PDB file of C-alpha atoms in Angstrom:
ATOM      1  CA  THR A   1     179.937  15.680 -34.011  1.00  0.00           C
ATOM      2  CA  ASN A   2     180.369  19.203 -32.658  1.00  0.00           C
ATOM      3  CA  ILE A   3     183.179  19.542 -35.191  1.00  0.00           C
ATOM      4  CA  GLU A   4     180.933  21.750 -37.311  1.00  0.00           C
ATOM      5  CA  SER A   5     182.333  25.173 -36.305  1.00  0.00           C
ATOM      6  CA  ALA A   6     184.320  27.103 -38.897  1.00  0.00           C
ATOM      7  CA  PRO A   7     187.148  29.726 -38.683  1.00  0.00           C
ATOM      8  CA  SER A   8     187.732  32.527 -41.165  1.00  0.00           C
ATOM      9  CA  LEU A   9     190.844  33.731 -42.979  1.00  0.00           C
ATOM     10  CA  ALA A  10     189.688  37.048 -44.478  1.00  0.00           C
ATOM     11  CA  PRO A  11     190.911  40.295 -42.901  1.00  0.00           C
ATOM     12  CA  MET A  12     188.225  41.740 -40.578  1.00  0.00           C
ATOM     13  CA  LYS A  13     186.938  45.335 -40.693  1.00  0.00           C
ATOM     14  CA  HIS A  14     187.547  47.734 -37.768  1.00  0.00           C
ATOM     15  CA  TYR A  15     184.666  49.269 -35.844  1.00  0.00           C
ATOM     16  CA  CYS A  16     184.520  51.752 -32.967  1.00  0.00           C
ATOM     17  CA  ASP A  17     184.127  49.961 -29.644  1.00  0.00           C
ATOM     18  CA  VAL A  18     181.894  52.730 -28.383  1.00  0.00           C
ATOM     19  CA  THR A  19     179.670  53.957 -31.207  1.00  0.00           C
ATOM     20  CA  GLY A  20     180.140  50.994 -33.588  1.00  0.00           C
ATOM     21  CA  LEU A  21     180.949  53.377 -36.439  1.00  0.00           C
ATOM     22  CA  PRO A  22     184.058  52.515 -38.463  1.00  0.00           C
ATOM     23  CA  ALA A  23     187.359  53.049 -36.581  1.00  0.00           C
ATOM     24  CA  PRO A  24     190.502  54.227 -38.360  1.00  0.00           C
ATOM     25  CA  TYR A  25     192.271  54.273 -34.968  1.00  0.00           C
ATOM     26  CA  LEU A  26     193.343  51.860 -32.270  1.00  0.00           C
ATOM     27  CA  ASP A  27     194.251  53.542 -28.988  1.00  0.00           C
ATOM     28  CA  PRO A  28     197.657  52.097 -27.822  1.00  0.00           C
ATOM     29  CA  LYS A  29     196.895  52.736 -24.147  1.00  0.00           C
ATOM     30  CA  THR A  30     193.418  51.225 -23.539  1.00  0.00           C
ATOM     31  CA  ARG A  31     193.349  49.228 -26.837  1.00  0.00           C
ATOM     32  CA  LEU A  32     189.773  50.415 -27.614  1.00  0.00           C
ATOM     33  CA  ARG A  33     189.040  51.096 -31.273  1.00  0.00           C
ATOM     34  CA  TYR A  34     187.444  54.493 -31.772  1.00  0.00           C
ATOM     35  CA  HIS A  35     185.946  56.682 -34.472  1.00  0.00           C
ATOM     36  CA  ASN A  36     187.239  60.166 -33.856  1.00  0.00           C
ATOM     37  CA  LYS A  37     188.791  62.633 -31.364  1.00  0.00           C
ATOM     38  CA  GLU A  38     185.450  63.121 -29.551  1.00  0.00           C
ATOM     39  CA  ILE A  39     185.316  59.416 -28.762  1.00  0.00           C
ATOM     40  CA  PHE A  40     189.008  59.327 -27.850  1.00  0.00           C
ATOM     41  CA  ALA A  41     188.293  62.065 -25.271  1.00  0.00           C
ATOM     42  CA  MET A  42     185.541  59.912 -23.661  1.00  0.00           C
ATOM     43  CA  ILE A  43     187.592  56.755 -23.828  1.00  0.00           C
ATOM     44  CA  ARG A  44     190.531  58.323 -21.942  1.00  0.00           C
ATOM     45  CA  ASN A  45     188.067  59.796 -19.399  1.00  0.00           C
ATOM     46  CA  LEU A  46     186.276  56.489 -18.741  1.00  0.00           C
ATOM     47  CA  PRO A  47     185.890  55.141 -15.179  1.00  0.00           C
ATOM     48  CA  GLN A  48     188.751  52.632 -14.730  1.00  0.00           C
ATOM     49  CA  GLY A  49     186.527  49.574 -14.873  1.00  0.00           C
ATOM     50  CA  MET A  50     184.646  50.627 -18.000  1.00  0.00           C
ATOM     51  CA  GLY A  51     187.483  50.107 -20.547  1.00  0.00           C
ATOM     52  CA  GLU A  52     187.510  46.360 -19.903  1.00  0.00           C
ATOM     53  CA  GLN A  53     183.714  46.288 -20.531  1.00  0.00           C
ATOM     54  CA  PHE A  54     184.058  47.808 -24.014  1.00  0.00           C
ATOM     55  CA  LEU A  55     186.660  45.150 -24.840  1.00  0.00           C
ATOM     56  CA  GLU A  56     184.555  42.340 -23.328  1.00  0.00           C
ATOM     57  CA  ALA A  57     181.480  43.310 -25.403  1.00  0.00           C
ATOM     58  CA  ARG A  58     183.552  41.925 -28.355  1.00  0.00           C
ATOM     59  CA  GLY A  59     185.064  39.155 -26.287  1.00  0.00           C
ATOM     60  CA  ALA A  60     188.374  40.962 -25.897  1.00  0.00           C
ATOM     61  CA  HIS A  61     190.239  41.547 -22.607  1.00  0.00           C
ATOM     62  CA  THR A  62     193.334  43.392 -21.677  1.00  0.00           C
ATOM     63  CA  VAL A  63     194.753  40.414 -19.813  1.00  0.00           C
TER      64      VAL A  63
ATOM     65  CA  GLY B   1     195.924  42.304 -74.766  1.00  0.00           C
ATOM     66  CA  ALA B   2     195.931  45.570 -72.911  1.00  0.00           C
ATOM     67  CA  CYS B   3     195.677  45.361 -69.148  1.00  0.00           C
ATOM     68  CA  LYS B   4     195.774  47.659 -66.167  1.00  0.00           C
ATOM     69  CA  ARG B   5     195.937  47.191 -62.367  1.00  0.00           C
ATOM     70  CA  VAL B   6     193.049  49.343 -61.190  1.00  0.00           C
ATOM     71  CA  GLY B   7     194.145  48.929 -57.594  1.00  0.00           C
ATOM     72  CA  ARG B   8     193.846  46.688 -54.535  1.00  0.00           C
ATOM     73  CA  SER B   9     190.327  45.610 -53.509  1.00  0.00           C
ATOM     74  CA  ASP B  10     189.154  47.360 -50.373  1.00  0.00           C
ATOM     75  CA  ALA B  11     188.028  43.987 -48.990  1.00  0.00           C
ATOM     76  CA  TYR B  12     191.743  43.825 -48.083  1.00  0.00           C
ATOM     77  CA  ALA B  13     191.826  47.437 -46.792  1.00  0.00           C
ATOM     78  CA  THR B  14     192.519  46.148 -43.216  1.00  0.00           C
ATOM     79  CA  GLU B  15     195.183  43.575 -44.210  1.00  0.00           C
ATOM     80  CA  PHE B  16     197.406  46.138 -42.412  1.00  0.00           C
ATOM     81  CA  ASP B  17     196.693  49.349 -40.543  1.00  0.00           C
ATOM     82  CA  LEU B  18     199.145  51.251 -42.796  1.00  0.00           C
ATOM     83  CA  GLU B  19     200.465  50.136 -46.125  1.00  0.00           C
ATOM     84  CA  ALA B  20     201.579  52.151 -49.151  1.00  0.00           C
ATOM     85  CA  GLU B  21     198.740  50.816 -51.261  1.00  0.00           C
ATOM     86  CA  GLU B  22     195.651  52.167 -53.031  1.00  0.00           C
ATOM     87  CA  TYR B  23     192.365  50.397 -52.074  1.00  0.00           C
ATOM     88  CA  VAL B  24     189.464  50.557 -54.492  1.00  0.00           C
ATOM     89  CA  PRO B  25     185.912  49.094 -54.292  1.00  0.00           C
ATOM     90  CA  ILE B  26     185.136  45.873 -56.085  1.00  0.00           C
ATOM     91  CA  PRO B  27     183.642  46.479 -59.563  1.00  0.00           C
ATOM     92  CA  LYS B  28     179.859  46.552 -59.143  1.00  0.00           C
ATOM     93  CA  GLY B  29     178.742  45.871 -62.689  1.00  0.00           C
ATOM     94  CA  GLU B  30     179.148  42.810 -64.856  1.00  0.00           C
ATOM     95  CA  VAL B  31     182.693  41.257 -64.851  1.00  0.00           C
ATOM     96  CA  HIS B  32     182.400  41.035 -68.629  1.00  0.00           C
ATOM     97  CA  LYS B  33     181.403  43.879 -70.979  1.00  0.00           C
ATOM     98  CA  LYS B  34     181.287  43.834 -74.766  1.00  0.00           C
ATOM     99  CA  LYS B  35     181.192  47.224 -76.608  1.00  0.00           C
ATOM    100  CA  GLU B  36     181.928  48.180 -80.183  1.00  0.00           C
ATOM    101  CA  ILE B  37     184.199  51.157 -80.873  1.00  0.00           C
ATOM    102  CA  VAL B  38     184.563  52.669 -84.357  1.00  0.00           C
ATOM    103  CA  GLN B  39     188.271  53.451 -84.258  1.00  0.00           C
ATOM    104  CA  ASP B  40     189.700  56.108 -86.578  1.00  0.00           C
ATOM    105  CA  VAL B  41     193.356  56.361 -87.565  1.00  0.00           C
ATOM    106  CA  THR B  42     195.121  58.136 -90.445  1.00  0.00           C
ATOM    107  CA  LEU B  43     197.826  57.103 -92.912  1.00  0.00           C
ATOM    108  CA  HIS B  44     200.237  59.381 -91.072  1.00  0.00           C
ATOM    109  CA  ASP B  45     199.592  57.493 -87.839  1.00  0.00           C
ATOM    110  CA  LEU B  46     200.691  54.323 -89.704  1.00  0.00           C
ATOM    111  CA  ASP B  47     203.791  56.143 -91.016  1.00  0.00           C
ATOM    112  CA  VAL B  48     204.825  57.248 -87.497  1.00  0.00           C
ATOM    113  CA  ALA B  49     204.207  53.841 -85.903  1.00  0.00           C
ATOM    114  CA  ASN B  50     206.207  52.127 -88.659  1.00  0.00           C
ATOM    115  CA  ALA B  51     209.051  54.615 -88.900  1.00  0.00           C
ATOM    116  CA  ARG B  52     210.297  54.235 -85.307  1.00  0.00           C
ATOM    117  CA  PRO B  53     209.433  52.463 -82.061  1.00  0.00           C
ATOM    118  CA  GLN B  54     206.741  54.525 -80.301  1.00  0.00           C
ATOM    119  CA  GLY B  55     205.672  55.011 -76.745  1.00  0.00           C
ATOM    120  CA  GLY B  56     206.689  52.352 -74.250  1.00  0.00           C
ATOM    121  CA  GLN B  57     208.782  50.657 -76.952  1.00  0.00           C
ATOM    122  CA  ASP B  58     211.364  53.473 -76.679  1.00  0.00           C
ATOM    123  CA  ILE B  59     212.130  54.248 -72.999  1.00  0.00           C
ATOM    124  CA  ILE B  60     215.661  55.635 -73.725  1.00  0.00           C
ATOM    125  CA  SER B  61     213.785  58.573 -75.359  1.00  0.00           C
ATOM    126  CA  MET B  62     213.660  59.878 -71.812  1.00  0.00           C
ATOM    127  CA  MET B  63     217.310  61.028 -72.317  1.00  0.00           C
ATOM    128  CA  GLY B  64     216.336  63.635 -74.886  1.00  0.00           C
ATOM    129  CA  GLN B  65     219.043  65.038 -77.171  1.00  0.00           C
ATOM    130  CA  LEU B  66     219.901  62.405 -79.787  1.00  0.00           C
TER     131      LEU B  66
END
């Protein structure tokens, strides 16, 4: 009766919000997950509206 | 009756972002294996094992001296 959806309890893997490659790192400032220093450089250089789009592509938002 | 902790399964590798833990892949073969090993000992090995507690039976051996 639309009570057929199911949550999950397993710990989820971490992927880079930009390249989708695995992400060891979560940026404390913009909260984007990122693969390496090259992508961290881009992420900190993004246009101010773009950071919220990378979050929103995985349904996340900063506020 | 021998057993060993090989590690923590890497399915849990993101249970935290840092933990003092060693994460290993799940075993990819059969969970059960049977293999036959022709073990060799000697009568001296039986002497030594029976003369005194050996290995992990005698931890105070770490003191040396007596």
